[PDB]
Amino acid sequence: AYARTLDRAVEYLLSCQKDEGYWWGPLLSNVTMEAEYVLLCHILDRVDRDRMEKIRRYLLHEQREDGTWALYPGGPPDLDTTIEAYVALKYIGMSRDEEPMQKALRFIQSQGGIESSRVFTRMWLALVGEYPWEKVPMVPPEIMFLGKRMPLNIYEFGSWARATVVALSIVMSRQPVFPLPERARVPELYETDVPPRRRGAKGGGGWIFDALDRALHGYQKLSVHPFRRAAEIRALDWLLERQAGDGSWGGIQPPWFYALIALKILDMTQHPAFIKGWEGLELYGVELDYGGWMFQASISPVWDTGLAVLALRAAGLPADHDRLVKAGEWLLDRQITVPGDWAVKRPNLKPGGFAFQFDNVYYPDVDDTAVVVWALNTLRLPDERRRRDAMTKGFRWIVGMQSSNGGWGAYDVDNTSDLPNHIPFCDFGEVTDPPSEDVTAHVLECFGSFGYDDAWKVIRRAVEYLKREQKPDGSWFGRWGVNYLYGTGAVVSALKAVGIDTREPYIQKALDWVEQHQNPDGGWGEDCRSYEDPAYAGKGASTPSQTAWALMALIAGGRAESEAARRGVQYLVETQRPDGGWDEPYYTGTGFPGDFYLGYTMYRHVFPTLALGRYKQAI
């Protein structure tokens, strides 16, 4: 029945593998990357007419009928995103009249204008001089002086926020302005009557931070700020030290862009770090066939390759397949062997993790490290010596990274401070990196492949963690994947791997929940709205990926021979394309619950293959 489906999928994936041996699908996000790029280019005075053109086509192509852009396909119009896409287009050339410009503009206004947008958006505008700097939450260079164990020192923030903050303190310190030509001025973003409905800090705003901020803008005005020179240089140095090998900073769009703006501010455009930072950008861009151009929020080579391998193995290929070997060898060369920021809380921990992108040594993550080590574990590479050793180093690093609550975070250990969530600046996405059910789950399944079970105290503390986090209806949240279907699939699959008993009440209470959400069409789906409003948990148009996740939960829970089970396998077998792949016009990846979603291009092909491989296994 499905056997042909699997064979078509296996050969499809294999054709997607690059020559070097890895897989790498693009990462989709939203138009703020490209819009911010255009502004970045203006700031750096490096505008390429031809590129601007490709970016316009893309911006438009992404606008919907109503004239707005969203955070995810088929999602509500987003104001920040739309405001930025708007300014970008006006800069590139479009007059405020044009049909597209008109719709967007009115959407923007009906929302309360620019005054209703997030900090970043108003800040970007502040940079080109279309918004007052005084109204932008202040992050001072001096933050650089807080010690390792002090409130709000840069290590209390999550890895992604940390670098962005450091980079920004240099910029906010100078509050620079790079004027837009008159043609692109956007005063009309203020022309509205609607009350400006302002978004506040992620966790709530104590009047302290509010006062403190007012203080800082006050202090900004003084004619002299002692030790500020040093605070700046501390920040600059912090950055020079961590620049990734591709020229980026963290391998993510924000800090990278800001770090470049900061360098420009410090007259360092003639410096190596800048040059390398600037030209590294091309590697993240993507030429779209319809003549457009997009910029990736980040890149997922390692991750893509790790999963690809696991799926192809579960599907049936030999642990020594000359093609999976290319992958294994490649993965071995990726292992990070030097201390990263994680070592501030684990100085005696030997380096052994892996990063998400190609070359980003200071920020390996537990998720990638667990998937890579595990996928390696399932292979037979020529140099069993290195495979043995690498797995070992990786294994140890993971174990050492476990947090207090028994669960793993992504980049740090106990990065659970609640302080940062209340600052006036932090009104967008996550700002700290606490442990999550999905990473913890993946870690568990990794150990599981080795044998380690419930006996080992490590695994026990984790399961304890998971049990305490389970939801009333039996589901598990999805921090990095959309959403409860992602988490629940991850957890149950994990628990099953570490020997727990699938028959337990809480396990069954989950397996039921899965079955109860199956869509009429035989597959499963969960819209991104499920982060915003609970009515959507387990609800949404079916996707190949989310179906594969729900299936894994079932197959792990013994219900592989169920109705819902076979029904789902039907859905995957049917919807498969003639080439062997699948389609997925929806995002199933999570950047930040509620604020940033991602489209993992390979998911639609890898998870179905993985779930089908595990089904063929249960028979």
Ligand X SMILES: C=CCN(C)CCCCCCOc1ccc2c(-c3ccc(Br)cc3)coc2c1
Which sequence positions are flagged as catalytic?
367
* Contact call for residue 164 and ligand X (CB under 6 A): yes
Figure out which of the listed residues 19, 97, 241, 384 binds ligand C8E, where binding follows CB under 6 A. Answer: 241
For residue 119, with 0-12 CB atoms within 10 Å meaning exposed, 13-18 middle and 19 or more buried, which class applies?
buried
The sheet that has 27-28: what strands, in order across it? 27-28, 596-600, 589-592
Contact characters 430-469, its own copies, x per CB under 8 A: ----------------------------------------
* Contact call for residue 365 and ligand X (CB under 6 A): yes
Judged by beta carbon distances under 5 to 8 A according to partner kind, the member of its own copies, ligand X, ligand C8E, none in contact with residue 19 is: none
> With respect to ligand X, which residue has the nearer C-beta, 296 or 575?
296
Figure out which of the listed residues 246, 367, 427, 527 binds ligand X, where binding follows CB under 6 A. Answer: 367
> With respect to its own copies, which residue has the nearer C-beta, 14 or 273?
273
Of 234-242, 509-517, 573-581, 608-616, which part binds ligand C8E (CB under 6 A)?
234-242
Of 178-186, 333-341, 350-358, 533-541, which part binds ligand C8E (CB under 6 A)?
333-341
* Contact call for residue 473 and its own copies (CB under 8 A): no
Judged by beta carbon distances under 5 to 8 A according to partner kind, the member of ligand C8E, ligand X, its own copies, none in contact with residue 276 is: its own copies
Judged by beta carbon distances under 5 to 8 A according to partner kind, the member of ligand X, ligand C8E, its own copies, none in contact with residue 341 is: ligand C8E
* Contact call for residue 252 and ligand X (CB under 6 A): yes
SS (H, E, C) 380-394: CCCCHHHHHHHHHHH
Pure H helices in 188-252? 207-221, 228-242
Figure out which of the listed residues 199, 276, 396, 471 binds its own copies, where binding follows CB under 8 A. Answer: 276
Residues 6+ apart with CB under 8 A from 315: 6, 9, 10, 609, 610, 612, 613, 616
Judged by beta carbon distances under 5 to 8 A according to partner kind, the member of ligand C8E, its own copies, ligand X, none in contact with residue 298 is: ligand X
Plot region of 83 (φ>0 → left; ψ -120 to 50 → alpha; else → beta): alpha
- E strands, 314-373, are none
Vertex 308 angle, CA 508 and 514, to 5°: 20
* Contact call for residue 228 and its own copies (CB under 8 A): no
Judged by beta carbon distances under 5 to 8 A according to partner kind, the member of ligand X, its own copies, ligand C8E, none in contact with residue 343 is: ligand C8E
With CA atoms as reference, report the closest residue to 426 among 261, 213, 115, 236: 213
Task: Give kind and range of the element (H or E) at residue 432.
Answer: none
DSSP reduced 3-state for 594: coil
Contact characters 548-567, ligand X, x per CB under 6 A: --------------------
* Contact call for residue 260 and its own copies (CB under 8 A): no
Of 91-99, 230-238, 282-290, 300-308, which part binds ligand C8E (CB under 6 A)?
230-238
With CA atoms as reference, report the closest residue to 513 among 480, 476, 558: 476
> With respect to its own copies, which residue has the nearer C-beta, 120 or 362?
362
For residue 325, with 0-12 CB atoms within 10 Å meaning exposed, 13-18 middle and 19 or more buried, which class applies?
middle
* Contact call for residue 29 and its own copies (CB under 8 A): no
With CA atoms as reference, report the closest residue to 301 among 16, 523, 509: 16
CA 270 to CA 272: how far, in whole Å?
Answer: 7
Per the CB < 8 A criterion, the answer to whether 78 and 126 are in contact is: no
Tokens of 117: 């947008």
| CB 462 to ligand X: min, Å | 18
CA 527 to CA 535: how far, in whole Å?
Answer: 10
Vertex 301 angle, CA 297 and 305, to 5°: 145
CA 156 to CA 148: how far, in whole Å?
Answer: 9
* Contact positions with ligand X (CB under 6 A) in 425-454: 428-429, 431
Of 108-116, 235-243, 425-433, 500-508, which part binds its own copies (CB under 8 A)?
235-243
Judged by beta carbon distances under 5 to 8 A according to partner kind, the member of ligand X, its own copies, ligand C8E, none in contact with residue 228 is: none
Residues 6+ apart with CB under 8 A from 231: 140, 141, 142, 143, 144, 145, 169, 173
* Contact call for residue 362 and ligand C8E (CB under 6 A): yes
| CB 6 to ligand C8E: min, Å | 44
Q: State the Rg of the chain over Cα.
A: 24
* Contact positions with its own copies (CB under 8 A) in 306-365: 337-338, 359, 361
Figure out which of the listed residues 272, 291, 534, 585 binds its own copies, where binding follows CB under 8 A. Answer: 272
Tokens of 297: 């929020």
| CB 372 to ligand C8E: min, Å | 21
* Contact call for residue 236 and its own copies (CB under 8 A): yes
What number of other Cβ atoms are within 10 A of residue 600's Cβ?
A: 23
Of 75-83, 109-117, 153-161, 237-245, which part binds its own copies (CB under 8 A)?
237-245
Per the CB < 8 A criterion, the answer to whether 422 and 204 are in contact is: yes
* Contact call for residue 241 and its own copies (CB under 8 A): yes
Residues 6+ apart with CB under 8 A from 238: 144, 154, 166
CA 399 to CA 67: how far, in whole Å?
Answer: 49
CA 2 to CA 574: how far, in whole Å?
Answer: 9
Of 206-214, 221-229, 238-246, 252-260, which part binds ligand X (CB under 6 A)?
252-260
Per the CB < 8 A criterion, the answer to whether 479 and 430 are in contact is: no
Q: Running DSSP on this structure, what letter comes out for residue 354?
A: B
CA 324 to CA 300: how far, in whole Å?
Answer: 18
* Contact call for residue 240 and its own copies (CB under 8 A): yes
* Contact call for residue 203 and ligand X (CB under 6 A): no
> With respect to its own copies, which residue has the nearer C-beta, 40 or 236?
236
Of 33-41, 81-89, 215-223, 337-345, which part binds ligand C8E (CB under 6 A)?
337-345
| CB 392 to ligand X: min, Å | 21
Of 122-130, 286-294, 423-431, 541-549, which part binds ligand X (CB under 6 A)?
423-431
> With respect to ligand X, which residue has the nearer C-beta, 434 or 580?
434
* Binding stretches for its own copies (CB under 8 A): 236-237, 240-241, 243-245, 247, 267-268, 270-273, 275-276, 337-338, 359, 361
* Binding stretches for ligand X (CB under 6 A): 160-161, 164, 252-254, 297-298, 303, 356, 365, 367-368, 410, 428-429, 431, 480-481, 591, 596
* Binding stretches for ligand C8E (CB under 6 A): 229, 232-233, 236, 241-242, 266, 268, 339-341, 343-344, 347, 362
